[PDB]
Design a protein around this ligand. Structure first.
Ligand SMILES: CC1=NC(=O)C(F)=C[C@H]1Cn1cnc(C(F)(F)C(F)F)c(Oc2cc(C(F)F)cc(C#N)c2C)c1=O
Lengths: 405, 539
C-alpha cells in the first residue's frame, strides 16, 4: 500500500527545462533507464504529462560507473509540507559532537517501495536528444525516487525496523537519515568505528541495501577566525586594513573596540609611513584577538529560516566561506583548500553542504562567485553528491574577501 | 483518409473547469451551405460524427472563401476549449541545425499526409469539441458534430500527434538502430549508409509500417529530391547554406526596413563569416515608429557596405563527421564584436556565428572572450553532443595572470593560443602594495540627495588639495569624479585612498570598455600611469 502525497495548495508540479547533455551522458542515461524500465521502476509517459524535472549523469562515489542524478529541487520545494511537516525526520544535536561520522549511500532502499499512483506524474523527466533528432525520452517514477525528500520521509518506518537491532546494540552510535544518505557517528577509536560501519553494512545487506575523506571528524571542526596580523613594523596602510577588518567584526562580535588604533590614523599621512604602536592600541589589539578566537555571542540558528552560504575565491587554490541566516551574523566560518576553478568551487560547495547537514540537518542556499552560464555548463562534470543545494550568483563585494582573507 | 488504430492519449480539462459553452452566431445561407458540404464529407471520412442534443458544449464555427478561389474552408474557433484544456509537455527542446547533420549515403523526405486527421482523439474528451452548423436564421435546431480526430487549432494536437509518431516508430527504431530518422512536425527525414537499392527497400518497409498505423507517406515518384529547402536553409548532398539573401538598396531606410535587414544579417551570420550588426542595431535604439525614416550614420553605412562584400558570393558549410574533433576559433572584430567559426578539417566550416558585448557593462576583452567561449560550448553540446577544442587570440600567460588574480571563478576548457591579431590583453594592472616615494591622495565624493549637487575632491600627504562642484549628480558619480581628479593631478606613480567600494570594484576588474563617459576617462588615465595603487577605508 502507498502513502498518498499531496502538493502544497496553489502550487502545481515542476515544469523545469532539461539542460543540454553531452553524447556520453545521454548514452549512459539511456542504458540506465532501459534497465530501470525493465525492472518496472520507471515507465515511458505520454504528452498529457506536462511536468518535467532535469536529469543528469554523474560519476559514483565508490566507482567509475555512471549514475543518474535527478534534480528534484523544484518538486522538493513544492512538497515541503509533506516531507517536513507531515513526515519530518528529527535532526540530532549529538551528531556534530561525534569523533567520526561516516556517510553511507542508502538510495537503493527506495526502489522497493512503490510510489502513490496520483503523485507519479510529478516525477516526469526527459532524456534529451542530440541536434533534436527525436523528441526526448520521457519517463515517470513507479517507485520512491532518489533525490526526492519525500522518499526518506515515506521509507522512515522501514528504516527504523532495519536499524532497530543495531541501535539497541550500540546506544551511543548516532544514525541520521538525510535524503539518500545515513550519517553514522561514534566516539570509538577509528578501527572500532570502521568495524561498526562494516557491521551496519551487513544489517543493510539483509534488506537489499548493498552500499571529503573516508570519515568526517566534526569534533575537529574549528572556525576560521577573523585574522589580525602579528607585526613588528606597522605602516599607515596596515593600520587602515586592520581598522577596516575590525569595523566589520564590530558589527558581528559584541565587545570589539577600535578607538585607540583609529587615533593612530590622525592626518593625511603617506601609506608606507611607519607608525609606532601605543600601549592602549596594543592592548586593544590583543583583546580583539581573544574575542575573534571565540564563537559569536548572540548568534543562534532559527529553524524557521533558510541558511545562506557565501564563498570567496582567495587565490592559490584557497577559498573562504561563511554560513549565516541574517547577513554577517555568522553561524560558522571555514576554508577550503586544494584542479581548475570550477572543480575547486564544486568541491567546496559539497564540503560546506555536508557540514551544514551534520550541524543543522539542512542545506544552505549558496551565493557563488561565478558567472551563471559557466557554472551551469560545468558544475555537473565534478559533482559527486546525490543531493543538490539551491544557489544564486554573486559579484563578491570588494573588501568582503579582504576581511575574511 | 486512414485514422490510426493507435491507443489514444487520455486528455483532461483544467481542474475545476467545465467544457466550453460558446453560442453559435447566425451565419449567412452561403456559409451554412459550405459548412454542411464540408461536414458531410468529413463525417463520411470518419473525422467528425453527428451528436444528439444531450451534449451541452459548443464552440463557434465559421466559413471563409477567398476572392480568388471557389474553395470554402471551415474554421473552428477553439479559443475557449484551449483555455480549458490541460497543459501539455513541450513539443521540442530545440530545432535541428544543418551543421549537426552527418554525411549519409542516402537521405529521404517522408511527409505525413493529413497528419492531425490521421490520429484519433480520446473518446472521453470528444464531447468538448462539439460545434453547431446553425439553421437558416437560427429558426430550427442546428446540425451538431464532434471531432473523432485531432482538430486543427486545438492545443493538444501538436504534442499528441508527435507522441503518436514516437510510439509508432519505437519498434522500427529498435529493429533498425543504424537508420537515422529525424522527427520534425509532420515530417520524417530518413537516412542510411546502405547501397541505393537496399535503402529504397528500407524506405518502402518504413512507409508500409507507417501505413499499418494509419499514416500515409509519398511514394518513390512523389518524394522530394535534393536540394531540400527547409526552414530558411538549403540542404545539398555534401554542403548546406542559408536560402538566398537579398540586401535591399533604399534611398530612405525605415525602422521596419532596418529590423528586417538585421534579421537577415543575423540569419546569414550562421555560415557567412564576419557579419556585423552593431551599428545597424544602434540605429534601432529609440522610440521611433515602424515607418519612421532613420538616416544611416557613417558607421552604419560602413558596416552595411562590409556586409554586402561578405555576401556578394555564396558560402556553404559542411556536414559533421563524428569521428573527428570539432575546432572553434574566435576573432575580435572591435567595439565589443566577436566572430567565430567551427570546423573539423581546416578551414571547411560546419558553421559560423558571432557574439556581442553586454550593454551597460564595465568590461574587458578577457571577460568578453570567456563569455563567447561559453556561448559556443553550449551551442556545440546541443548540436553535436560534445565541446570543441578552442583556438583563441590570447596568450596562455595573459589568461593565467587574469584567472589567478580575478575574484570570480573562471575557466576555459582545452584551448590553444593562435596568433591572429588583434590579440586579447589587459591594458593596465594595479599594484599589490603602496608605492614608496609616490604621493597619497585621500579622495572624497559626496552628493546632497535633496539638491542633487555634489562635490568631488582630495587632500594629499604632500599638502595638495582640490574641490570641484558637480550639478545633477549622485554619490557614485562624485566618488568616480574624486578618483579621476586624483589621476589627473598626480604624476606617473600614485597611491589613492577611497571610501568607495563601488569605484574600487570597477577598477579592480581592469575594464577597458564602459557605457559611462566617466569610467572611460578613468581608463585613459589608468593606462598612461606607471604605478597605481588603490586602497579602501571605511567612511
Ligand atoms: C547527407 C545529405 N544528403 C542529401 O542528399 C541532402 F540533400 C542532405 C543531406 C544532409 N542530411 C543528413 N542527414 C539527414 C537526416 F535527417 F539525419 C536523415 F535523413 F538521415 C538529413 O535529413 C534532413 C534533415 C533536416 C533537418 F532536420 F535538419 C531537414 C531535411 C529536409 N527537408 C532533411 C532531408 C539531411 O538533409
Amino acid at each position: 500500500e502507498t502513502v498518498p502525497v499531496k502538493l502544497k495548495p496553489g502550487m502545481d508540479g515542476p515544469k523545469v527545462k532539461q539542460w543540454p547533455l553531452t553524447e556520453e551522458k545521454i548514452k549512459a542515461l539511456v542504458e540506465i533507464c532501459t534497465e530501470m524500465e525493465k525492472e518496472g521502476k520507471i515507465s515511458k509517459i505520454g504528452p498529457e504529462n506536462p511536468y518535467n524535472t532535469p536529469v543528469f549523469a554523474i560519476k559514483k562515489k565508490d566507482s567509475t560507473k555512471w549514475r543518474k542524478l535527478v534534480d528534484f529541487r523544484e518538486l522538493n520545494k513544492r512538497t515541503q509540507d509533506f516531507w517536513e511537516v507531515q513526515l519530518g525526520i528529527p535532526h540530532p544535536a549529538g551528531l556534530k559532537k561525534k569523533k567520526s561520522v561516516t556517510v553511507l549511500d542508502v538510495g537503493d532502499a527506495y526502489f522497493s517501495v512503490p510510489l502513490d499512483e496520483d503523485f507519479r506524474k510529478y516525477t516526469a523527466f526527459t532524456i534529451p536528444s542530440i541536434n533534436n533528432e527525436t523528441p526526448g525520452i520521457r519517463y515517470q517514477y513507479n517507485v520512491l525516487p532518489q533525490g526526492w525528500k519525500g522518499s526518506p520521509a515515506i521509507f522512515q518506518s522501514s528504516m527504523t525496523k532495519i536499524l532497530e537491532p543495531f541501535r539497541k546494540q550500540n546506544p551511543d552510535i548516532v544514525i541520521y537519515q538525510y535524503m539518500d544518505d545515513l550519517y553514522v557517528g561514534s566516539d570509538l577509536e577509528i578501527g572500532q568505528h570502521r568495524t561498526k560501519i562494516e557491521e551496519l553494512r551487513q544489517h543493510l545487506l539483509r534488506w537489499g541495501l548493498t552500499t571529503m575523506g573516508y570519515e568526517l571528524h566534526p569534533d575537529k571542526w574549528t572556525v576560521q577566525p577573523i585574522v589580525l596580523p602579528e607585526k613588528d613594523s606597522w605602516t599607515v596602510n596596515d593600520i587602515q586594513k586592520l581598522v577596516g577588518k575590525l569595523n566589520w567584526a564590530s558589527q558581528i562580535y559584541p565587545g570589539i573596540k577600535v578607538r585607540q588604533l583609529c587615533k593612530l590614523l590622525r592626518g593625511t599621512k603617506a601609506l608606507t609611513e611607519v607608525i609606532p604602536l601605543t600601549e592602549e592600541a596594543e592592548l586593544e589589539l590583543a583583546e580583539n584577538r581573544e574575542i575573534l578566537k571565540e564563537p559569536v555571542h548572540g548568534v543562534y540558528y532559527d529553524p524557521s529560516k533558510d541558511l545562506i552560504a557565501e564563498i570567496q575565491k582567495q587565490g592559490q587554490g584557497q577559498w573562504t566561506y561563511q554560513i549565516y541566516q541574517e547577513p554577517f551574523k555568522n553561524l560558522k566560518t571555514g576554508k577550503y583548500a586544494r584542479t581548475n576553478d570550477v572543480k575547486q568551487l564544486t568541491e567546496a560547495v559539497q564540503k560546506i553542504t555536508t557540514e551544514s547537514i551534520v550541524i543543522w540537518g539542512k542545506t544552505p542556499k549558496f551565493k557563488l562567485p561565478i558567472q551563471k552560464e559557466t557554472w551551469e555548463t560545468w558544475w555537473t562534470e565534478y559533482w559527486q553528491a546525490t543531493w543538490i543545494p539551491e544557489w544564486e550568483f554573486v559579484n563578491t563585494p570588494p573588501l568582503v574577501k579582504l576581511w575574511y582573507q
